[PDB]
Ligand binder design. Structure first.
Ligand SMILES: *[C@@H]1O[C@H](CO)[C@@H](O[C@@H]2O[C@H](CO)[C@@H](O[C@@H]3O[C@H](CO[C@@H]4O[C@H](CO)[C@@H](O)[C@H](O)[C@@H]4O)[C@@H](O)[C@H](O[C@H]4O[C@H](CO)[C@@H](O)[C@H](O)[C@@H]4O)[C@@H]3O)[C@H](O)[C@H]2NC(C)=O)[C@H](O)[C@H]1NC(C)=O
Lengths: 98, 113, 75, 122, 49, 49, 75
């Protein structure tokens, strides 16, 4: 989001309450659960009004408190993790014995 | 094709003084479904590009100084400045967004008296 | 809304420092601390409830701590 | 933080067509309706054309209707304006206005481009 | 009631539809294991300057 | 160094119990209550006779 | 600010509907439910803790429920 990235858990992503969509890169996507942004406010049982609730960017940044950031900018280069390997040193030579 | 007529064409006022600009419409720009009034006020500073001061009749836009406030209900809208500074030189083009062929006003000019 | 479900303790843990690991650590504690400083009467209510629902001292302490931790966290 | 920069403005003789280009940055382009506006020297601001979020829907000002064409290359994050049968009257500083960030109007202006100058004269 | 042009007194229904347009979405992208490239750098204690 | 972001959405959910008041021109509050005494000594009804 | 200090119970009370009342009436309850459905083992751990601390059929239930309310929302 907004030139930033994080390695979130898949289920946690699927759980958070924001209107998602198919993400097929087509135009005019249809968003599911639109009620999470609009807020209708019946004042005195006289009439009804609609609000859009503004930008969730700051709240989303807070809701990533345990995530690990990576460098998506440039080449999607992940710089967090670990790896295990074993080293076969049978073929090495010292180059200095002689 | 609502034509926007502005009352003042030149407003020379001393600093630290109020100012009232009027943009009178040829038809009420009050959208029936929501009850809002779509009248916008821009300011193109000399040698600059136009900004957006009040993105409705009276709800000012973000980043706008505290003094810019509007009014008006059906056709007689106003742009009230509380205390004029030296930066208020410009052209206060009003606009109506009610109809698709939206038309600006001729736009007043403000200078320091 | 979204802020109520931070991505904390999900399970993927690594050497590299996570996002906002310095600020977002004591955020929950500071919330409760400010709430307790702002609303003092519920302290008396929780003391009364712990005394009258706990027959052992450890039960009283646990009930009091949980009551203090549950209401600001709830709202 | 959004940046709208003009391009394509230059001199041109009457009757010779010209294609203007509005490069966009700082926001997701495909979700925003875009506009073209012009200010003839010493004249009031005059809106030219609008393209909505869906590419197909377009509208033009009647004073310039049938002479211009507006296109959206949202894959490259840029706007295209095609000016045809230019008149010596059709000389002005041309702007590129974004859709409103917050509000109710489907089409409004909140951020204006730096501006380009096109001159139609002999 | 009668003040709103309706003869019957009571509670009335009401709906409010509004077209919702999304600006600046958030993309979520998976990674497939046939396109992941780890990189290991190995340096010998050559004693180089 | 990274700026956190825009706290408007978080603010709107942090105001989930507050009461809205219309603020355009005059800040005309619409929620509240008032206690008033009604002194009906001088008050009469038309056409008793 | 952060969505952890809502204006739920404190302060004024009026007859008009407060901003975002119906949308946020059950927000924390939904959060607790989804957290519990996502992390079931803590239910077992809470049952263990309750059954091994200060057991009496009212205390054994109140401590369990209070802890199951504390941990998810506290997060
Ligand atoms: C959602 O809400 C928006 C705005 O709130 C609505 O936007 C409308 O868009 C349409 C076009 O898509 C606009 O139509 C224009 O109407 C102009 C009105 O002129 C006369 O109006 C009277 C009614 O008072 C009619 O009886 C007359 O016949 C005239 O139409 C009209 O002049 C204009 O046409 C002119 O301009 C176009 C473009 O320049 C030329 O191509 C055309 O030849 C002609 O010269 C348009 O037809 C309408 O005004 C907008 N309404 C508002 C309130 O802004 C949407 O319709 C709403 N719905 C949806 C689904 O988006």
């Amino acid at each position: 989001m907004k030139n930033k990235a994080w390695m979130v858990h898949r289920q946690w992503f699927f759980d958070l309450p924001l209107p998602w969509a198919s993400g097929a890169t087509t135009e005019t996507p249809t968003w599911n659960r639109k009620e999470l942004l609009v807020t209708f406010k019946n004042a005195h049982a006289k009439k009804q009004e609609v609000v859009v609730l503004g930008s969730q960017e700051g709240a989303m940044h807070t809701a990533l408190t345990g995530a690990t950031e990576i460098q998506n900018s440039g080449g999607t280069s992940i710089f967090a993790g670990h790896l295990k390997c074993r080293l076969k040193m049978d073929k090495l030579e010292l180059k200095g014995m002689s | 094709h609502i034509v926007m007529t502005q009352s003042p064409l030149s407003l020379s006022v001393t600093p630290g003084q109020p100012a009232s600009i009027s943009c009178k419409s040829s038809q009420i720009s009050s959208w029936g479904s929501d009850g809002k009034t779509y009248l916008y006020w821009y300011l193109q500073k000399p040698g600059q590009s136009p900004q957006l001061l009040i993105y409705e009749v009276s709800s000012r836009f973000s980043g706008v100084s505290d003094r810019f406030s509007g009014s008006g209900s059906g056709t007689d809208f106003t742009l009230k400045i509380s205390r004029v500074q030296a930066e208020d030189v410009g052209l206060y083009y009003c606009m109506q967004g009610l109809h698709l062929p939206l038309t600006f006003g001729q736009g007043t000019r403000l200078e320091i008296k | 809304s979204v802020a109520l479900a931070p991505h904390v303790g999900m399970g993927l843990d690594t050497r590299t420092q996570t996002w906002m690991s310095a600020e977002g650590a004591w955020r929950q504690v500071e919330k409760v601390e400010t709430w307790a400083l702002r609303h003092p009467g519920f302290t008396i209510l929780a003391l009364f409830l712990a005394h009258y629902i706990g027959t052992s001292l450890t039960q009283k302490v646990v009930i009091f701590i949980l009551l203090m931790l549950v209401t600001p966290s709830m709202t | 933080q959004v940046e709208l920069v003009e391009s394509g403005g230059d001199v041109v003789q009457p009757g010779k067509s010209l294609r203007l280009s509005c490069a966009a940055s700082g926001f997701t382009f495909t979700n925003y309706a875009m506009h073209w506006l012009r200010q003839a020297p010493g004249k009031g601001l005059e809106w030219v054309a609008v393209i909505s979020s869906d590419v197909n829907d377009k509208y033009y000002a009647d004073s310039v209707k049938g002479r211009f064409t507006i296109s959206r290359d949202n894959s490259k994050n840029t706007l295209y304006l095609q000016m045809n049968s230019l008149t010596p009257e059709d000389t002005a500083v041309y702007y590129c206005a974004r859709e409103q960030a917050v509000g109710t109007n489907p089409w409004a202006f909140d951020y204006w481009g730096q501006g380009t100058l096109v001159t139609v004269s002999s | 009631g009668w003040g709103n042009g309706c003869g019957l007194f009571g509670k009335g229904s009401l709906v409010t539809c509004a077209k919702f347009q999304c600006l600046e979405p958030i993309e979520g992208k998976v990674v497939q294991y046939e396109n992941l490239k780890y990189t290991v750098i190995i340096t010998v204690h050559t004693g180089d300057q």
